[PDB]
Assembly symmetry: C3
Homo-oligomer: 227 residues x 3
Amino acid sequence: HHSSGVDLGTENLYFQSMMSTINNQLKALKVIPVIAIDNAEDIIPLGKVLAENGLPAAEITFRSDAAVEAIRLLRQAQPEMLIGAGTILNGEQALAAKEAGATFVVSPGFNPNTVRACQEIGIDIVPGVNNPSTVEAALEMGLTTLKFFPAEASGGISMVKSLVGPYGDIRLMPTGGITPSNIDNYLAIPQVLACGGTWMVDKKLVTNGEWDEIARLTREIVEQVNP
Amino acid sequence: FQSMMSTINNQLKALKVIPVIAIDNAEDIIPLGKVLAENGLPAAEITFRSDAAVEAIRLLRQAQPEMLIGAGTILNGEQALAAKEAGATFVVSPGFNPNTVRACQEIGIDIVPGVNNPSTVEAALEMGLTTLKFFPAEASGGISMVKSLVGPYGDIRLMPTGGITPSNIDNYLAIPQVLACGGTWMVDKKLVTNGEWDEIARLTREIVEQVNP
Amino acid sequence: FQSMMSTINNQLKALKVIPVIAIDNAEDIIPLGKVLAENGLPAAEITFRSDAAVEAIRLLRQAQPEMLIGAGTILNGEQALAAKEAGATFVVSPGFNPNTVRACQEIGIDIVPGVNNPSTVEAALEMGLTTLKFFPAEASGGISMVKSLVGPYGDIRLMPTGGITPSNIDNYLAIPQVLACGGTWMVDKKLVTNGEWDEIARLTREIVEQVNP
Ligand SMILES: [Cl-]
Ligand SMILES: [Cl-]
Ligand SMILES: [Cl-]
Ligand SMILES: [Cl-]
Ligand SMILES: [Cl-]
Ligand SMILES: [Cl-]
Ligand SMILES: [Cl-]
């Protein structure tokens, strides 16, 4: 669909602008809660605990059927929060996330068809990679901020280090197996911007109403990454 | 071409372990298949490591008609055709080549291609595939990697192969989206070459009892 | 353009270890090349990750016309052409990009692209490439992964690079399909920058003796 006044060049510039905006937010935040939610309504207490404990960011995974409604609820409850959608496998999901109010999408792997879709609809994508060939594919599409996933199972910090060496332009968001015990090892790598983590918002705590624990874990990581 | 994947998925889920066979002399598939079948494991993935694989599939299908027979190391459509004509009902590739997958669709045989990371999984899903080989399983990160793939991709079902042994197979089978694992240990070429039929029978009975107690 | 891969493979096979050089000051390549050659390793893969790489290739080719010189970190055809014009014998890439491979064909320079899993191997094989860099070797699963790849893909010849040291190189070289490994330890930035020519010479003599006794 064509918007009056918007040519292909403007769409490209817009996508670049959105990439820069997201990059700067990630670099400041350093840790992104990765949220898998059963009941959409649970996103409200969870967003409140995150925000009031100093972590105004959430990536809601489309692995749950509740994801789109959760994004819509959180967006309304927490206007200032950085909200992303994860597990985005195609352009239809990307669009649904955008409509609901997300300002970036993340995918577990790299699919150029998903990337082209996001570049067209004007939502930043940070796609998952785990080897040099996939990094090269992403670079060729003009992306530089990539998710590194699954981080620990793909070789952890030694893989990150091996991986960023040849590619000076990339910035990574390692996700998968990140905990308070290893997050600083990742963040020590200059080309790592932020890590994704589930432990501070773990489904086991959410489903069992353990809001005080979520709060404690959130405060702990916020202090740890930006002391 | 009507896909037999629902049938294959069910057979794999029942078997839990698929012998991955590298045969030197095709004739050797006959006693090997007899030992596998009579010890409770009526399945075989015959790898295309040499021309002898084609004859082996043909001999095995004649000797053990109800055996689940796949062909492995299938790198192109020509080999997929050779396997189909020999009597295999599915092919397996170590990695994912969409040109091979397309060729298999055209010639009409099911393929279970190998993947080992999220991007390759997404490539397969985009071509309509959901049953995938996870290879090489241990060298790619093992159960930790398997859990990372099945997690985001609820539709996939995996056949981990590579470094699977009786000491680690239970951990893989404990993951619901794992259908079965491929294993060479009970059909190791050394055992076949040396005619260690009693030992092959023992390893086969032992694994069948282990996975299907 | 007739490919020199035959010659390249023979040279790699003879050398067994290839210095992977990230150079800060192009002029450093002259003494470094001399020390490497005079101590038995007349080869260098100079990475384009360094701004000095093109000038270093030119200087080294003039100073050591018989040196095997590879240009590393080649991500597109523009760089490949720059490498060819500078005097490189071949180009190396950390991963596999069909666009780079196509450009190298056009330009007329051999490429040894990087791979680390079966799907990427199949992609390379489908473009007619058989000599491949296995990178990053240790972080991708090391010798267990190498064994997993060379098994189903008998035609490939590998150059493992990434985490290789005198303590682990023999384990790679013991695999028949491994031609040579890339290593940075004998040309480490710290040594080259600080002009530790005697230490570079020692390390070079030591590995040459180790792999070619
Ligand atoms: Cl994701
Ligand atoms: Cl992980
Ligand atoms: Cl296979
Ligand atoms: Cl393995
Ligand atoms: Cl390289
Ligand atoms: Cl890949
Ligand atoms: Cl490494």
